[PDB]
Structure formats: structure tokens, C-alpha cells
């Protein structure tokens, strides 16, 4: 349980939500899968529920040191060096808080409205390789201490 903090620079024109979506999360999927070892993702300053402001900070949860060095963050999320930062230290942070995946129900055509706008207050968008259908994944923050392919804790 040490760490590596990747930062989403502000300004830059493009919104940080889009930057999070496109660049980061594909590379992460891949990274996580081949490794398979269930990791996790630290979204510090994850502000409010009315909000959903994921923030400008990304940290990766790992177990061993070679545990996070397992992933070559730098060199991967590298080409994009003007919209994402890669810090260069592995810190053994202990005040971390884990993050969980809620869901929210499908549509009436696919009480629907009751579940709607209860979780709809993060909504990261991922395009699927096989089914070819883009969708939203919702997040949460929780007490569980000691996950899945997406970096979120398994259901």
C-alpha cells in the first residue's frame, strides 16, 4: 500500500473530465488486466455528492513496491505530457480512502426516476471493444480498507 500521484493540470483548454475519460482510463484498463492483480485508484480531493468533482489529482493504490513499479506509469501516460503529470516517488501513504462503484438501474424502456438523480450526482465514459456501446460508470468513496479491472472494488 504505497503510492504514485498523477496530476491533471488545470487551465489547458479541455475540461479535466474529458482528459480523465479519453487518455487515462484505456491505458489503465490495459495496465490493470495484464497485471490482473486487483489494484485501485485514489481520487483525492473527491469533494461533494452534490458535486461529483472528481478533482485534478489521481493516485494509484498498490501493495508491493515492485508492486506499483509493476506498472510503468511513466513511459505510458507519457506522450500526453502537457495535460497529465507523472510524479516520481512511491510514497507509503496511510491516510488513503478507498473508492467503490455504485450502479443506478437501467431505463424504463430498456421507480426508474427514483434511482435516477440519486447516483447521477462521477459518470466516466468508456467505449467497449466487443459490444461497441459506450456507457457511464459511477463511483463512490468508502471505508473497507483491504478490486476489479476498472480499479474500483469488486462487486
Amino acid at each position: 500500500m504505497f503510492s504514485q500521484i498523477l496530476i491533471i493540470k488545470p487551465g489547458t483548454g479541455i475540461s479535466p473530465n474529458i482528459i480523465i475519460s479519453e487518455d487515462i482510463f484505456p491505458v489503465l484498463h490495459s495496465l490493470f488486466v495484464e497485471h490482473d492483480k486487483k489494484f485501485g485508484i485514489t481520487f483525492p480531493a473527491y469533494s461533494f455528492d452534490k458535486k461529483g468533482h472528481l478533482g485534478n489529482i489521481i493516485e494509484v493504490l498498490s501493495e508491493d513496491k515492485e508492486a506499483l513499479a509493476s506498472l510503468c506509469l511513466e513511459e505510458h501516460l507519457a506522450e500526453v505530457t502537457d495535460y497529465v503529470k507523472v510524479k516520481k516517488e512511491i510514497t507509503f501513504t496511510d491516510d488513503y480512502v478507498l473508492f467503490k462503484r455504485i450502479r443506478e438501474e437501467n431505463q424504463y424502456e430498456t421507480h426508474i426516476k427514483k434511482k435516477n438523480q440519486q447516483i447521477f450526482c462521477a459518470y466516466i465514459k468508456v467505449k467497449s471493444a466487443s459490444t461497441g456501446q459506450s456507457y457511464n460508470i459511477f463511483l463512490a468513496p468508502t471505508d473497507i480498507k483491504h478490486f476489479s479491472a476498472y480499479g474500483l472494488l469488486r462487486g
Binding site: K9, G11, T12, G13, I14
Partner: protein
Amino acid sequence: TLKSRPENLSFARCLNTTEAKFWQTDFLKRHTFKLPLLITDSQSCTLSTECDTLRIDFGIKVLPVKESMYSCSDYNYRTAIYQKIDEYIAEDGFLTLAKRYVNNIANARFLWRNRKGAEIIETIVTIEDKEYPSFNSKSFNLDTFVEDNATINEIAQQIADTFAGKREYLNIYVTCFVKIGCAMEVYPSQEMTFKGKKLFKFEGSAGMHSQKINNALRTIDTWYPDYTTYEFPIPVENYGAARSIGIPFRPDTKSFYKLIDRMILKNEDLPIEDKHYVMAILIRGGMFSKKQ
């Protein structure tokens, strides 16, 4: 002698920007070839299969700063403004600000969303009948400011001399080549509806508003109070504000109204950074009046 701002005070612009127009192009035959790019009916626009390059053409007009006041109801305030401007042209010949404006052209910030996910970006700048050596665009960060590049210095000298008053006009024409790939989206500017995303058409083709490019060139403010915490340039505004992250970076005694009613009403010599910000607001323009 002076008690308040007059009842009618206005400044005009000194950086006038034309609207942009889009074209399709192929990269290896770019300087012999050009095709229109139209909006495909929401509304969306995507490049053709046979082309892999977007082309942006726009131009800028540079006007002097003294001859940019449209109205003033008190001659004494006008004399005070002209005296403070000549005191600025004594120290710095509008050269740091002009270097920052050429730096925003070099950084290619005007390509707002169209900058992410490109593989080669080139920008050529034409003044008069001379084309200046091109730019690499992916070797300049969006948070620094280069001060040792010779071509940037050569453009910035002429821009600074035209704002000073030693020249009466300058016309700058800029072309940009962005290689995104075949069948990718181009993301043009969206119009205002007083439902559905309706995009903007200029002469049949697509393009950006001049306001969006002028917002890109004015991100030259690195002299705000809380600079050390968040270290990112902010666009120049009166009650200094950034729609990116929700925070008034100038609510109070560092705002333009107090800093101009602390230079002309109470003749105190301000630091050079605040003078830079006040002159940048005067190269932007606006209505600055006071009831009574």
C-alpha cells in the same frame, strides 16, 4: 485635483481578430491543395476519408494604445492617462506583453480541443510579403513562456513598436496545419440559442468565432495574488475570473477598478506587474464609468 472617474469613459480594442475558416488538406501535398469542409446534419462535422489534415486561417490587426480612447468627459483624466502611458513607454516598450502574445500564437492555444490527439502541428506567420520560419507547436508548454526564440523576438519587436506609436498599423496573417488523421472529428464552435447543438457556419464552411481566439491570446496573466499555489496562466479580466475552476482570483484591492483608482486619483507609483496588468486591460478594452 481629481476626485473620481468621469461619467462616460470607454476604450476600444488594440488587438482585432478575424474569424477562422476550416479546410481539408492532405499533409504531403499541403502546399498545392485545398478543399472545403462543411457541417453534416444534432449537428456534427467530420473529416473525409481521403484527407487527414485540418487547416486554420485567420488574421490579426494591431492598433496603437494612445489612440484607443473613444470617450472621456474630463480633459484632466485624459492628460493623466497619456502621461502614465508615456511613463510606461519610457521603461518597457510594450515588449514583455507582446512577447507573451506571440507566445500564445506559438503555443497553438487557439486550437482549443483540436490540440489533443494530434501528431504534427505546424504554424507559419506571414507579415507584409515575408513568411517567417515555422513553429513546431508540440515543443512549447501551455504553462511557460519562452523568451529566447529569435523569430518570436522579431515578431514581438514589430508588435511592440506598433503599440508604442512608432508605427500606425500592423496586419498579421497566420496559417495552421493540424494532422489528426482520416475520419476524425474537428470540434468547431457552437452558437447561442435563445434544443440541440447547432454549430457555426462561416461562408458555407465551418470555423471559430473571433472571440474564442481572442480569449486564447489573452491568457497572459501570471501576476495574480495566489500565483504560487495554482501555477497556471489566467485570462485577463477586470474582476479576474477563470471559468475553468470556480474561483475569483481578484475580488478586491488587486482588481482593475481599485488599481486604476490608485494610480490616477492618488499618484502613487505601483509595481511593474500591476502596471503590466493595467496596460493589458487597456489593450483589451471596455466601458469603465462611474455613476455620479
